[PDB]
Amino acid sequence: TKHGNKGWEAALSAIEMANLFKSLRGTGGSGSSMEIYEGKLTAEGLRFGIVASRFNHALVDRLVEGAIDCIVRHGGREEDITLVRVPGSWEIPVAAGELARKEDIDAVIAIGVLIRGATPHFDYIASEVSKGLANLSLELRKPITFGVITA
Amino acid sequence: GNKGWEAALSAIEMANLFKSLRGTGGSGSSMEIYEGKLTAEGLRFGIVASRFNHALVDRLVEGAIDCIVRHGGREEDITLVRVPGSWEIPVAAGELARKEDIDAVIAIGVLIRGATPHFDYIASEVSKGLANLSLELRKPITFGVITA
Amino acid sequence: AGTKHGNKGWEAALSAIEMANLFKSLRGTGGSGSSMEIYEGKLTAEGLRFGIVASRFNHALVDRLVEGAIDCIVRHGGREEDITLVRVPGSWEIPVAAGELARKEDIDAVIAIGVLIRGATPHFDYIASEVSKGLANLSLELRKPITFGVITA
Amino acid sequence: GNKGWEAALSAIEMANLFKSLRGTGGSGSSMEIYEGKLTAEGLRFGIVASRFNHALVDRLVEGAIDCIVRHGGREEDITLVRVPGSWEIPVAAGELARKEDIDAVIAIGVLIRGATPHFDYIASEVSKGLANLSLELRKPITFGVITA
Amino acid sequence: GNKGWEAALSAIEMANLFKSLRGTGGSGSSMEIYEGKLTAEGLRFGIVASRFNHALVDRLVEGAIDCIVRHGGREEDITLVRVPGSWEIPVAAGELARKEDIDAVIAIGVLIRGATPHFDYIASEVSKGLANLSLELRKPITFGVITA
Amino acid sequence: GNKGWEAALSAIEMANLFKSLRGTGGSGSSMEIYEGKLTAEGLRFGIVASRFNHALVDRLVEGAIDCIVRHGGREEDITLVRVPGSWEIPVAAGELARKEDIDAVIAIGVLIRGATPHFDYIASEVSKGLANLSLELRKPITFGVITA
Amino acid sequence: GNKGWEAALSAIEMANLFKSLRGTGGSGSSMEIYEGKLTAEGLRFGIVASRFNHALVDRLVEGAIDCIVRHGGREEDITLVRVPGSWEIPVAAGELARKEDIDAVIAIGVLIRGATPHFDYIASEVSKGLANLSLELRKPITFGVITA
Amino acid sequence: GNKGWEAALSAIEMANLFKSLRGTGGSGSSMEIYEGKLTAEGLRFGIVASRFNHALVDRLVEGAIDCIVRHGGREEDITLVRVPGSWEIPVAAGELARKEDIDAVIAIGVLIRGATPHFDYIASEVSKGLANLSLELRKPITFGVITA
Amino acid sequence: GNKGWEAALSAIEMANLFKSLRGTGGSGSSMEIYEGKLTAEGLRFGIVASRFNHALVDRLVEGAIDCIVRHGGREEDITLVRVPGSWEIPVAAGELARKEDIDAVIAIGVLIRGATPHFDYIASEVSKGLANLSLELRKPITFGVITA
């Protein structure tokens, strides 16, 4: 909305996708016209989960704060947020798969930082984060949002 | 002039082609050819569009509906789903392609070319997800994502 | 169409929602005491009504700002039937038209959008100064929030 | 054209706009857009101009008259008042605006920034005075003051 | 404004000028000067527009309709025709100009010249056809084409 | 794609536009809009194609026939005329256009401009002839001529 | 030669290899070697060919049919399916491969990589889909896709 | 044009020249001139065409057949023989030339000289063989071989 | 991959073509086409290979036999003749092509490119001799000589 940091933006997507899926599962329109499905930016009664890495905790800490501020401003509740910390970026996909299988959580947010300017070997690590997170959403049929910064 | 029109045209042809393959009847002793007509009467479509780049998607969505109506389709048979960004298109498409009333799905969006790893990785995953989903569910899904 | 963070039409609409909700809290029943009371606004737009005043100059820029403003209200819970739009020749006419809207008993906030070309030559530095003065004075006299979406190129 | 043509156009549109707000609202079920036409039939106007640099000022007053006539307004529905200098435009404009038979006012004038310091307090006060009139009386007043 | 706005004004002015020429005479005993006013009540119009993507010509058509309605015209008295491309405008313009209840015609299009042959030849023929039609049917036709 | 496909699409749409434009008009109560559908059921077509550049023109003619048949047309309702070169296209098009059982005409050919000023004069005359015929006979003639 | 001929040769040999590999094994007394003969008597084939680049793909399809017929195959035992573009090849190949009267599938098409990053993503997904289908269904699918 | 058309024109003229040259001579009283007419009514032809460069040679063969039929020949009086490559053209031409119901032979093919010295030797031997056969058998054989 | 395979494939086609030409039977009233199948059953071949370049010829001879066996031929029907150098191929080929049991002859060898008159003259004579011998004896002889 206004803050701009990728934690804020990543949380806006999660709030909208969580609302969209309830609309889809509910029912169709009255009829005699084109059906439209959209999600609104209201976080009243939604459960969220956040997975964040520890490498560069200075930058990650602000991003995790920004995502939490976004949820409360739009009507969320601080008690309906679960946070998990992992040693590094290689472990984000495996950790998020555990949250997604919970029957309560409705959306999942991944935050982290990637170093791709000093070592010509991290490219292997970076590519697997994007693949693993994307495959999980299709398999479990649950929205998972990308909040990964590159340094 | 726009990829929205092109994507909708492929969807019409693929929908008619799958009715011919899943059919039985008399045939001759010669070679057998299966083709798709461009008559949109009686078919039901689904569109999934992202909001990125503000108003450019609205231009693409307008072209898609124009193709369906002018080729014989009815505007009561379209379903529109809107998602926040390009990263969200595959998951929304899967939900829309798992219901028996839909015959084909069209994906529209705009991607960024900021020359950053953040966008380069997102771009690849959009294409791979839509490709796998059409093979898993055996339903045609058309690609209408442009850049800039 | 629409927009998100970056466009000045979206930020202005955000302030209006927060201010419109804040006033309803202030006029509400007082608290029970026993501690300090903190008043702040929620980003919910359900049941609110707005007005927008836009200038026709620089059709390319202004058009996308008006789309951003309308997009913000709808996404956050607004209803399309509860927005009134007014077009005017130029920036000099914005304050007078805004006053007509603010007096309606069924308008909770007002958003002003326009583009200023100050600095190039005279006849515009005078215009720019008075637009800021008029909108500010109207807000205090009428006691309704009035947001300032005017940009400069 | 000239700045006088532009000022008359704004007056015609604002005068029509105010006549719409005072009327009934739209049918509902959608956004209400209020805008002003450019028909000048049935409207009464007023012009206030200064003598200084009569060569330039006369051209501007001709432009305003041309614009109103071309758009379908009679010359019998125009009141013209002339004043010694720029300092007297706002007080002169106040008398016209209080009448119930005038629906818009146009100010024409020319100033000189490169003059003595005494002719600088005047320059800023013209803008302030006309602005406060419009909000006070709730009646459009248009600006047509240029500089040499 | 946009060239859809500019083109529509010339049709309002020229449609009024003709009604004066083929009617009653002037005062007499002196030179007769003719000119058209910018009123549009009672006039009938026709707009012919091409297709180029779905965005850049929609703006020019909306600018044209706004000019007529704000300057006094009725929406009941406008006919809009869409054609595949620039090459098809003159044949479509001919059909409208032959109708007894149309007073002027506005042509809006996009020429993408400067790219490849097959388009440096189309441009030269579009201007000639509209020019000939006006001199052959005695009905003004206004030119509203942009360059991509 | 190929200009054979594009030229047949334009012909199908103009043939439908002229049926509605020559029928009963709208009752009223709104602006009247005329558009052409992309359905080719019950329409007759003629094609004029040159012979030079043996390989190319055969591909263009196949494209045009494929477009008509896949939109609902019948191969029995197509007339094909072959001519030696581009210079001869306009004269043959006149004969087809003057028949009362043809709704539109498609012109295909290859211009070999690039040298030999003998061929620079031929290029300019093919466009002129086709444009005049369409206006004279009041029938749509589509341009499908490319440059090698 | 052309990849149409090469792709049909590979399909004929793999179809023969899978007949001997699924039959009775060797008695023993030596190393067992399995090879495919180049005889196409009694085998069924399917072909999936796109449409873009109208001229090229037609030459490739003729090459594939010529190879089969001249090796002993019958034109009555060939199935042909046409699709709009390269993006649609993998989905159609799945339907043909799941039939119980087809021994191998040949995929033909033209990729237009070279610009417009829209087409750079399509290129990588056609190979992935065809490779996975062959392993999943346990049927040989041959790659006959070239680049323009 | 194409060498297929040129090679068939030469064959038609030489076939007519050999009929008059083998008939009764002129009575006298002037110089005797023998010429060949361009009429192909009652003459038989044979064509030998290679296969390499799949697309090109098919266009050349169509040109040759079109020339004969449009000059009065019958498609029933044409014999066509296909060979793998250019190296094989002379040997097949000998078999056709030795039949007593053929008046001339047309040889078509594509030489792929440009690299691979393997193909530089083949080029020189095709011309030698065709030239010797014509002199040995006393029948006209026309050269229709191009270079890619 | 190697010219030994290519030379053997031409031999099979030419052998089958000469059985069709030297045949009689019923025929239709349409055009007559003679082609060669790629079935090697019942045919008898001859190979002439040189020893130069040590082991490279062994690779070429291996490819030739693989083609004949896999297309249906029997290894008891091949005759292999080995000569010291390329200069000796034509004389050995003539002896092998003069016996009635042989249907086609294949020539394989390697030439040197030392840029010397000794090798430049030898290279030319190998090609000319094999070309003449096929015309004298009316039997197909295939060229499979490579360089380096």
Coordinates of C-alpha atoms in Angstrom, one line a residue, chain G residues 32-129:
Chain G
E32 CA 21.6 -61.1 -26.3
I33 CA 21.4 -58.2 -28.7
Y34 CA 18.2 -56.4 -29.6
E35 CA 18.0 -54.3 -32.7
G36 CA 15.2 -52.7 -34.8
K37 CA 14.6 -53.5 -38.4
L38 CA 13.6 -50.8 -41.0
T39 CA 10.3 -52.5 -42.1
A40 CA 7.0 -50.8 -41.5
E41 CA 4.5 -53.6 -42.4
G42 CA 1.7 -53.8 -39.9
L43 CA 2.4 -50.8 -37.7
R44 CA 0.3 -47.8 -36.9
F45 CA 1.5 -44.2 -36.5
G46 CA 0.3 -40.9 -35.3
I47 CA 1.6 -37.4 -36.3
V48 CA 1.1 -34.1 -34.5
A49 CA 2.1 -31.1 -36.5
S50 CA 1.6 -27.4 -35.8
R51 CA 0.5 -24.7 -38.2
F52 CA 2.8 -21.7 -37.8
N53 CA 5.1 -21.1 -40.7
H54 CA 2.5 -22.3 -43.1
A55 CA 5.0 -23.3 -45.9
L56 CA 7.6 -25.1 -43.9
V57 CA 5.6 -27.5 -41.8
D58 CA 3.7 -28.8 -44.9
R59 CA 7.0 -30.0 -46.4
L60 CA 7.9 -31.8 -43.2
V61 CA 4.6 -33.7 -43.0
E62 CA 5.0 -34.8 -46.6
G63 CA 8.4 -36.2 -45.8
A64 CA 7.2 -38.2 -42.9
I65 CA 4.4 -39.8 -44.9
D66 CA 6.7 -40.6 -47.8
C67 CA 9.1 -42.4 -45.5
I68 CA 6.4 -44.7 -44.0
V69 CA 4.7 -45.6 -47.3
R70 CA 8.0 -46.5 -49.0
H71 CA 9.1 -48.8 -46.2
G72 CA 5.9 -50.9 -46.5
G73 CA 3.4 -49.0 -44.4
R74 CA -0.2 -48.3 -45.4
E75 CA -1.6 -44.8 -45.7
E76 CA -4.7 -46.1 -44.0
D77 CA -2.7 -46.7 -40.8
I78 CA -1.7 -43.1 -40.2
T79 CA -3.5 -40.5 -38.0
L80 CA -2.8 -36.8 -38.4
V81 CA -3.7 -34.1 -35.9
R82 CA -3.2 -30.3 -36.5
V83 CA -2.7 -27.8 -33.7
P84 CA -2.4 -24.0 -33.8
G85 CA 1.2 -23.6 -32.4
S86 CA 4.1 -25.2 -30.8
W87 CA 2.8 -24.6 -27.3
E88 CA -0.1 -27.0 -28.0
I89 CA 1.9 -30.0 -29.3
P90 CA 2.5 -31.8 -26.0
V91 CA -1.1 -31.8 -24.9
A92 CA -2.3 -33.3 -28.2
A93 CA 0.5 -35.9 -28.2
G94 CA -0.8 -37.2 -24.8
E95 CA -4.2 -38.0 -26.3
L96 CA -2.7 -39.9 -29.3
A97 CA -0.3 -41.8 -27.1
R98 CA -3.0 -43.1 -24.8
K99 CA -4.8 -45.0 -27.6
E100 CA -4.2 -48.7 -27.8
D101 CA -3.9 -48.9 -31.6
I102 CA -0.9 -46.6 -32.0
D103 CA 2.7 -47.8 -31.8
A104 CA 4.6 -44.5 -32.0
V105 CA 4.1 -40.8 -32.3
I106 CA 6.0 -38.2 -34.4
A107 CA 6.0 -34.5 -33.3
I108 CA 6.7 -31.8 -35.9
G109 CA 6.8 -28.0 -35.7
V110 CA 8.7 -24.8 -36.1
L111 CA 10.1 -22.7 -33.2
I112 CA 10.4 -19.0 -34.1
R113 CA 13.0 -18.1 -31.4
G114 CA 15.1 -15.1 -32.2
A115 CA 13.3 -12.2 -30.5
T116 CA 10.2 -11.4 -28.5
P117 CA 11.0 -13.1 -25.2
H118 CA 7.4 -14.3 -25.2
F119 CA 8.7 -17.1 -27.6
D120 CA 11.9 -17.9 -25.6
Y121 CA 9.8 -19.5 -22.8
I122 CA 7.7 -21.6 -25.2
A123 CA 10.8 -23.2 -26.6
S124 CA 12.0 -24.8 -23.4
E125 CA 8.6 -26.2 -22.5
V126 CA 7.9 -28.3 -25.6
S127 CA 10.9 -30.5 -25.1
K128 CA 10.2 -31.0 -21.4
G129 CA 6.6 -32.1 -22.0

